[PDB]
RNA sequence: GGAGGUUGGCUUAGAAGCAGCCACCCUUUAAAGAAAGCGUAAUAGCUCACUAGUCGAGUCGGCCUGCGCGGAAGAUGUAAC
RNA sequence: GAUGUCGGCUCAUCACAUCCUGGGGCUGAAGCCGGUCCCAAGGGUAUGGCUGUUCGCCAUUUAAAGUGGUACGCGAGCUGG
């Protein structure tokens, strides 16, 4: 079955500002998300959305699935805050957020001072945990990746930053 | 990677992807199944 | 001394009387060696008995030359005759007593030994 | 925690202390070996005591391990009815003197036939195939 | 869930479903190959097989066949429309 | 009815199938070292003993002492072993 047939069913008072060319979702708990579609057909029902497609190519059969999952992510974003759990493994490692600055201790010679780009906040409930709250998956996921690539993990000790638990392999020395 | 002329699967976990015009093999298991060109 | 195949004597007691330069250590092709540099000698003429036998590859430091050393001034010290001091496998000297003067320009990290036995 | 059957363990019936029959065979399981013996003491006097007894163990973290009532065992007692201690170098095709169905009748009179079986006849047929491990065919 | 015996034997802490050689059975049982593969090579575990929900229309491999170079690196200057 | 042949000196220019430095999958990669394969031509790339020698074998270095094309580059530029 195809994901382009299932509707959106946007919950709890989410406002659509659709022009036909540039859909604009505005809700509570963060707002101002918008996308532009190249050529699909968007109908606007009583609480759901269906994405009809034009010319039956391989490239309109592929867009209507992509633009359905992108609109669905904007609905959940104003509904729920996207988060990523990053744990720290290793001795002498720590992290502490200072407002909008995330400064780390990774066993280097000089400490790294990572700056968050936009309206996206990193909270640290521990010295070995990061929680990155945002509104869109691609911008939460990009910032979580760039922190991870400071010190990627190791098959011999595991000594390096490591997000949501199931990522790791190992071997003996 | 391991540049060949004939790529193929080795275990049950290998999926063959054609990424940017080249036939790659990525393995969700053991990294020694990673094969580049073919 | 300052070139390959430069005969120069030693300033040492245990050694041989004359040695000859065969290789200037350092860079890719260092052509000259001033005062305070490591060369590699062959032993050309030995005392009837000392410690070092004739015809043996050793390692030495250069301590006196007739071209001179030049400090941060116009003022230069210029001897007459060339002179080396043999070293061990590790760079520490072989003999006990050093003959004649040295310069103060040689004293460094690794050469506080020979400037003790120097008198300058 | 550890939910899959055929978890393999051979220590004695009432006695979990001898490790060189298994060694570190229960390390990544999580539970140390000493507190198992309170569960081996709960199933004694029928499961070939004195000799090391292989038993279906079910791993729990509540300091208790329930075992399947396998009343008379067959991994070692079928060696006793055949006449060997150590089986052949390749079982069921290399032979040292095998067991037949004429000698399986006496040992299977104590099966407690719904605890490792359902009826009495197929528990004899269970120990028919339970000899098929170690150099003992089914010859009749 | 993922087998009844049952640690599948000689062996080796361990060879047990995953040393080497193998048994490849019969059976508790909606189900179970005393194992297909990972997993501490190996102990678990994850699964796979196969059965209960969940899901509510297609799905799966192969055979021929038209057009497409991945394989494809050289010496003065693009430089085998 | 003539296109002067080997090695040396002087001066060079291009290829990349990379010797060094630069970026990097995998490892039977603990660390220091490595092995192997993709990307990269910007600048570098030893003095001697012995032989007519290129080649080689040695002694001592160095970050490294690269493999080819250019009438086996170069005599109206030199030498003539």
């Amino acid at each position: 079955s195809r994901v382009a047939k299932n509707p959106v069913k946007l919950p709890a008072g989410v406002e659509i500002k659709l022009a036909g060319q540039q859909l604009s979702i505005k809700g509570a708990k963060g707002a101002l998300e918008l996308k532009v579609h190249p050529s699909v057909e968007v109908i606007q029902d009583s609480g759901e959305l269906r994405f009809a497609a034009r010319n039956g190519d391989q490239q309109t059969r592929a867009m209507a699935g992509t633009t359905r999952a992108l609109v669905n992510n904007m609905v959940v974003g104003v509904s729920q805050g996207f988060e990523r759990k990053l744990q720290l493994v290793g001795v002498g490692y720590k992290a502490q957020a200072k407002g909008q600055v995330l400064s780390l201790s990774l066993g280097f010679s000089h400490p790294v001072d990572y700056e968050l780009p936009a309206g996206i906040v990193a909270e640290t409930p521990s010295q070995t945990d990061i929680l990155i709250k945002g509104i869109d998956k691609q911008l939460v996921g990009q910032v979580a990746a760039e922190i991870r690539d400071f010190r990627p993990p190791e098959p011999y000790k595991g000594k390096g930053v490591r997000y949501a638990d199931e990522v790791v392999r190992r071997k003996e020395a | 990677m391991k540049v060949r002329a004939s790529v193929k699967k080795l275990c049950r976990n290998c999926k063959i992807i054609r990424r940017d015009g080249i036939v790659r093999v990525i393995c969700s298991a053991e990294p020694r199944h990673k094969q580049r060109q073919g | 001394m300052i070139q390959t195949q430069s005969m120069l004597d030693v300033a040492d007691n245990s050694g041989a009387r004359r040695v000859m330069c065969i290789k200037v250590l350092g860079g890719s092709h260092r052509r000259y060696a001033g005062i305070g540099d490591i060369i590699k000698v062959t032993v050309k003429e030995a005392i009837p008995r000392g410690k070092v036998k004739k015809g043996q590859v050793m390692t030495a430091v250069v301590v006196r030359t007739k071209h001179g050393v030049r400090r941060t001034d116009g003022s230069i010290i210029r001897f007459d005759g060339n002179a080396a001091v043999l070293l061990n496998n590790k760079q520490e000297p072989i003999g006990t007593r050093i003959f004649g003067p040295v310069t103060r320009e040689l004293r460094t990290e690794k050469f506080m030994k020979i400037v003790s036995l120097a008198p300058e | 925690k550890k939910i899959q059957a055929y978890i393999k363990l051979q220590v004695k019936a009432g006695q979990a202390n001898p490790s060189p029959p298994v060694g570190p065979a229960l390390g990544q399981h999580g539970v140390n070996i000493m507190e198992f013996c309170k569960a081996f003491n709960a199933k004694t006097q029928g499961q070939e005591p004195g000799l090391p007894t292989p038993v279906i163990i079910t791993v729990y973290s509540d300091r208790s391990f329930t075992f399947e009532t396998k009343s008379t065992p067959a991994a070692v007692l079928l060696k006793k009815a055949a006449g060997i201690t150590s089986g052949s170098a390749r079982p069921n095709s290399q032979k040292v003197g095998t067991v037949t169905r004429a000698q399986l009748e006496e040992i299977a009179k104590t099966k407690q036939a719904d605890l490792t079986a359902a009826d009495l006849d197929a528990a004899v047929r269970t120990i028919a195939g339970s000899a098929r491990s170690m150099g003992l065919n089914v010859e009749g």
Side-chain angles (χ1 to χ4, degrees), chain D:
Chain D
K1 181 176 170 65
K2 303 292 185 183
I3 300 172
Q4 192 174 7
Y6 283 166
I7 292 173
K8 272 72 69 179
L9 180 62
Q10 179 176 356
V11 298
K12 281 81 179 175
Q15 183 71 36
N17 301 114
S19 291
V22 289
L26 298 170
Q28 201 181 7
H29 292 77
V31 184
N32 289 319
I33 316 298
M34 277 62 254
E35 290 85 4
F36 280 96
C37 186
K38 293 180 177 67
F40 290 95
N41 288 318
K43 283 172 91 286
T44 59
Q45 296 297 109
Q47 282 72 240
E48 196 176 5
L51 291 177
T53 298
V55 62
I56 297 292
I57 71 168
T58 306
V59 172
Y60 292 108
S61 66
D62 291 331
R63 301 295 93 192
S64 65
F65 296 95
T66 177
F67 296 161
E68 185 174 359
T69 53
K70 50 179 66 62
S71 66
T72 177
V76 185
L77 284 176
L78 289 179
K79 300 186 177 73
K80 308 289 103 177
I84 63 167
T85 63
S86 68
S88 300
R90 176 256 184 91
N92 305 115
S93 299
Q94 185 171 359
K95 296 297 179 180
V96 287
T98 183
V99 68
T100 61
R101 288 181 180 270
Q103 294 179 357
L104 293 172
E105 186 177 1
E106 184 68 28
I107 309 298
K109 290 182 174 67
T110 62
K111 295 300 290 181
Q112 296 179 357
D114 204 2
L115 298 178
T116 184
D119 58 346
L120 183 63
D121 292 330
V124 181
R125 287 190 296 272
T126 297
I127 72 167
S130 299
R132 295 295 296 266
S133 301
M134 46 193 68
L136 305 179
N137 275 327
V138 178
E139 295 179 354

Side-chain angles (χ1 to χ4, degrees), chain B residues 4-6 12 22 37-38:
Chain B
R4 304 288 300 277
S6 71
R12 67 174 67 183
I22 306 299
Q37 180 269 125

Side-chain angles (χ1 to χ4, degrees), chain A residues 55-67:
Chain A
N55 305 111
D57 285 327
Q58 284 78 244
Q59 198 58 42
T60 63
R61 196 176 70 252
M63 284 296 174
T66 303
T67 191

Side-chain angles (χ1 to χ4, degrees), chain A residues 11-22:
Chain A
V14 169
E15 185 264 328
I16 306 294
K17 185 60 64 69
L18 177 59
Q21 192 60 256
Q22 186 178 1

